[PDB]
Design a protein around this ligand. Structure first.
Ligand SMILES: *[C@@H]1O[C@H](CO[C@@H]2O[C@@H](C)[C@@H](O)[C@@H](O)[C@@H]2O)[C@@H](O[C@@H]2O[C@H](CO)[C@@H](O)[C@H](O)[C@H]2NC(C)=O)[C@H](O)[C@H]1NC(C)=O
Ligand SMILES: *[C@@H]1O[C@H](CO[C@@H]2O[C@@H](C)[C@@H](O)[C@@H](O)[C@@H]2O)[C@@H](O[C@@H]2O[C@H](CO)[C@@H](O)[C@H](O)[C@H]2NC(C)=O)[C@H](O)[C@H]1NC(C)=O
Ligand code: NAG
Ligand code: UCY
Lengths: 537, 536
């Protein structure tokens, strides 16, 4: 009648999973485990409530719904954008997580990788094909967990101080899932004393906010931040700007029938169909921009007691290992979403005039003086108008400002204040990539190799890329169980720690590890050391 | 009996010159010709007055007195500083000029070169050995004129608005000599319709100011600006700060103070010249290198606007300009106040010294501006490497004071009608007494332009002599035609500088090599960004 490996009792009740075929052998998957009560109706915008115990057996046999979110339509049918779009029905009933474990279940406690997807805090899902945990768990014999968390207004609309919309509830969704991991992962063979968070972009920023929030920090041990940081200019928002955005969203959908009582304002928002909120989400941004999202974590003293910058600088990080990195062309994806002259369908060889206009789109809402400093640093004054150079320069502007330099500041301060840090740059352009050649290794395209997707026989990767993907999974799993991506296998070469002075990182591509110095050191000194001084003067 | 070639009648009266030897043949020299009434006593600080005629024969066989000035004492007896110090007695009776001419004197109109010496507007003299005109005149058959002009407070103390100390009188000293050239150079064989001005440091700044002042502009036809420009942060001063400096000088020497300019000048006019000199450095507002107390003042008269303003607004069609810099404009000044520097060690400074140095090399700017300097000149892969910090602070001082002011002048003149030729001078003299770490310092191309290597009693190499002959030929080609290129191909040709291509040549023992950008990255900072920052 039943297979005992696919039957697990967690604190809330009994579950039943499925046996997954993988290239390397069987895996057990428990997909769509409810960890919170559904945040519908009166519970919209509220902190997650833990799932109430149930009698009988819950079937955890497929991914559950995607949290309600905007759906990208810029290049309809284009795989390079469709791969990030929801692959399940949209619902507010979306607080489910997924556990993958070896078959048979490990005998001794196994280290746990917990994945947190990105999507700008406005999109994403744990169900996307590229986040398929079966290949890591098979190849490296870890337990892998991933959760859904609310995005957009449903996760991050904030009327700060208000009780019916406190903000950051999507982060509370993540923390609740992490608490579930502590109470329940042992039932699957996982070690709750060896839990490594990892995430990418907004998921990397989320990992960092759990590092900086004491109530989250007791729930994990190690951290991996791929292409994102809590201190990025896009990842948090101030209390007053959160209130302005929430209030203008309400105003754009009829509430109140501007501002007033927070109770009455939210109650009105709660009567609007979810899709009506999503249809107005982008209209609350203060300007024309790229790499800016409407509802993101708010710095209000609760989750984050201070800005991520301050908490990073103040923190004692002894006993912490982190792995951080970026892709080679962090900035190119976002240019086709609004920078003038840019398209995935031509070479985007912009003019000087379009470059100067792009600077204000990619560095939005800074003084004319601050914009001048950006143009000074990124113009090559022996070739101020060469279109090819202007295209790469604008990519560097957006990439450095939003990802590389925030990651570099995080890496540097954690190292200087007690953490062992490892840093990479991912430099392989996947043979299957559908974006144009000028975009390089675009943001987000290391994930499929980390997750071992090239081992999927259904896909058409080269054999080199399969070997490469196996290499990355090992670094990640080695870091997960030891805090060090290196393996006692000296030639391999070795991946040295990142430090504030030497600033060493390794390149990840088909060739063997190559050590290098400085995460765009010259550029990041402008973003991390000089530009803040200028904006307060 | 007497030599006819060395007797000359100028509008003021009669002169007796002297024959000079060179290894290429004789030249005729007329040294110490008075062109102004001695600006003494009641005429201290006033505009110069033309020399009243004389009877008899003025003896023009010897250099005349040096205008009263500070004497460098940083390294007593050291050749590298002594060569710039006065080599004749000091006197306020110093307004004389010198003419060198071929022997026998030309009988057709010969192109004229007019030398204006540098010295920060606080020092200098036309009699310095390194400014000896005999080799250029023999080798390139030009007429060469140089004049003394008042420096320090005597030339540039300004109480703006006052008739008793108007300012810029040293500049007027220069203009009066240019007028004297127009009226008298033909008596020596010179062609008053082909006058090329050239000068170095403060002399190059002086040249640029005559370019931008209409009453001077009809007195010459082309300009050479070596390692200086009128828009450099040091070459001019605002009316308010000029008044504050003149006023503190009066305090420091016992003069007052409802206030009154007439009385303050009158009390200054009673002090011995040396007393003013003794307090000259103490009116500067802060510790600094490359700043000088009494410089040209922008008051709407000699200069009706700032030089940067006048550069931007000018129609420079019909102008040919030759401009350039040495390879290490900043090194020299570092040993005069940058913490950690000496000509006697390697000056391998620390990061803390580098940061303190930045406030000395970029004085009187906001903390934000200084931070922006540190951002640009730090290698953030090597923020504390002492050799890189020494080089970077040299670059800060050189770019801010010379290279980038020259690049801006060149770019805007070229984009507004002028034909511009740019060089970087990259040859370290075999005879150089400054340490190796200073490279090719400020001022050490002059001796090659004047052909001093041809002097056999000096210790230059045979290939250094050929180099001097090359440079003299470029300079003289430029004076005769507005084009340094030897009108003949291999070459490579020296192409004109333009705001886009930014082409210049390097001058060393190797043949001409063409390069792009007078430190375009750094000068974008100083010329385009930093002005915006200081406004807001
Ligand atoms: C590169 O493309 C952009 C985007 O234009 C769109 O995409 C093209 C590939 C093509 O499908 C066009 O028909 C589309 O309009 C071009 O920039 C656009 O230029 C048009 C006018 O020419 C203007 O109306 C749009 O606003 C512009 N869009 C943006 C984002 O600026 C750009 O000119 C193309 N570059 C070339 C052809 O060199
Ligand atoms: C390089 O020299 C400077 C200048 O020092 C002076 O000149 C030297 C030749 C020697 O005679 C020193 O004693 C002189 O003071 C040195 O900078 C000075 O250092 C001393 C202490 O060593 C300090 O009291 C002064 O303030 C410094 N002066 C300045 C202008 O900063 C520097 O130490 C020397 N570098 C070395 C020795 O590595
Ligand atoms: C009828 C109704 O909605 N009353 C509420 C009240 O309970 C609440 O205390 C107040 C907060 O400002 O808002 C209003
Ligand atoms: C600042 P500039 O006038 O340079 C001067 C001092 C000549 C010189 C001695 C090189």
């Amino acid at each position: 009648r039943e297979d005992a490996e696919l039957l697990v009792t967690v604190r809330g009740g009994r579950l039943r999973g499925i046996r997954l075929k993988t290239p390397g052998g069987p895996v057990s998957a428990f997909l769509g485990i409810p960890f919170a009560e559904p945040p519908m109706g009166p519970r919209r915008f509220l902190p997650p409530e833990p799932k109430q115990p149930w009698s009988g057996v819950v079937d955890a046999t497929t991914f559950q719904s995607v949290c309600y979110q905007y759906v990208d339509t810029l290049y309809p049918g284009f795989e390079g954008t469709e791969m990030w779009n929801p692959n399940r029905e949209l619902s507010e009933d979306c607080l489910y997580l997924n556990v993958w474990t070896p078959y048979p279940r490990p005998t001794s406690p196994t280290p746990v990788l917990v994945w947190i997807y990105g999507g700008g805090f406005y999109s994403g899902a744990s169900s996307l094909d590229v986040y398929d945990g079966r290949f890591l768990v098979q190849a490296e014999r870890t337990v892998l967990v991933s959760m859904n968390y609310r995005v957009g207004a449903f996760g991050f609309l904030a009327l700060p101080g208000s009780r019916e919309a406190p903000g950051n509830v999507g982060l509370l969704d993540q923390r609740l899932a992490l608490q579930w991991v502590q109470e329940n992962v042992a039932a699957f063979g996982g070690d709750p004393t060896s839990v490594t968070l990892f995430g990418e972009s907004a998921g990397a920023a989320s990992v960092g906010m759990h590092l900086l929030s004491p109530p989250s920090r007791g729930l994990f041990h190690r951290a991996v931040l791929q292409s994102g940081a809590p201190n990025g200019p896009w990842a948090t928002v101030g209390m007053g700007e959160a209130r302005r955005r929430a209030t203008q969203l309400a105003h754009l959908v009829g509430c109140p029938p501007t501002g007033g009582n927070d109770t009455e304002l939210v109650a009105c928002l709660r009567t609007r169909p979810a899709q009506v909120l999503v249809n107005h989400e982008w209209h609350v941004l203060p300007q024309e921009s790229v790499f800016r999202f409407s509802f993101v974590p708010v710095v209000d003293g609760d989750f984050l007691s201070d800005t991520p910058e301050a908490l990073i600088n103040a923190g004692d990080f002894h006993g912490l290992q982190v792995l951080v990195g970026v892709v080679k062309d962090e900035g190119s994806y976002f240019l086709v979403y609004g920078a003038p002259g840019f398209s995935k369908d031509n070479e985007s060889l912009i003019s000087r005039a379009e470059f100067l206009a792009g600077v204000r789109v990619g560095v939005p809402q800074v003084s004319d003086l601050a914009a001048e400093a950006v143009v000074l640093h990124y113009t090559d004054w022996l070739h101020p108008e060469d279109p090819a150079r202007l295209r790469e320069a604008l990519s560097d502007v957006v990439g450095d400002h939003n990802v590389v330099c925030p990651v570099a500041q995080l890496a540097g301060r954690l190292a200087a204040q007690g953490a062992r840090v490892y840093a990479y740059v991912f430099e392989h352009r996947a043979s299957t990539l559908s974006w144009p050649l000028w975009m390089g290794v675009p943001h987000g395209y290391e994930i499929e190799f980390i997750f071992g997707i090239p081992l999927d026989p259904s896909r058409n990767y080269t054999a080199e890329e399969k070997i490469f993907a196996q290499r990355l999974m090992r670094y990640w799993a080695n870091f997960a169980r030891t805090g060090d991506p290196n393996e006692p296998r000296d030639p391999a070469p070795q991946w040295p720690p990142y430090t504030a002075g030497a600033q060493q990182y390794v390149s990840l591509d088909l060739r063997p590890l190559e050590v290098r110095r400085g995460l765009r050191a010259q550029a990041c000194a402008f973003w991390n050391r000089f530009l803040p001084k200028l904006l307060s003067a």
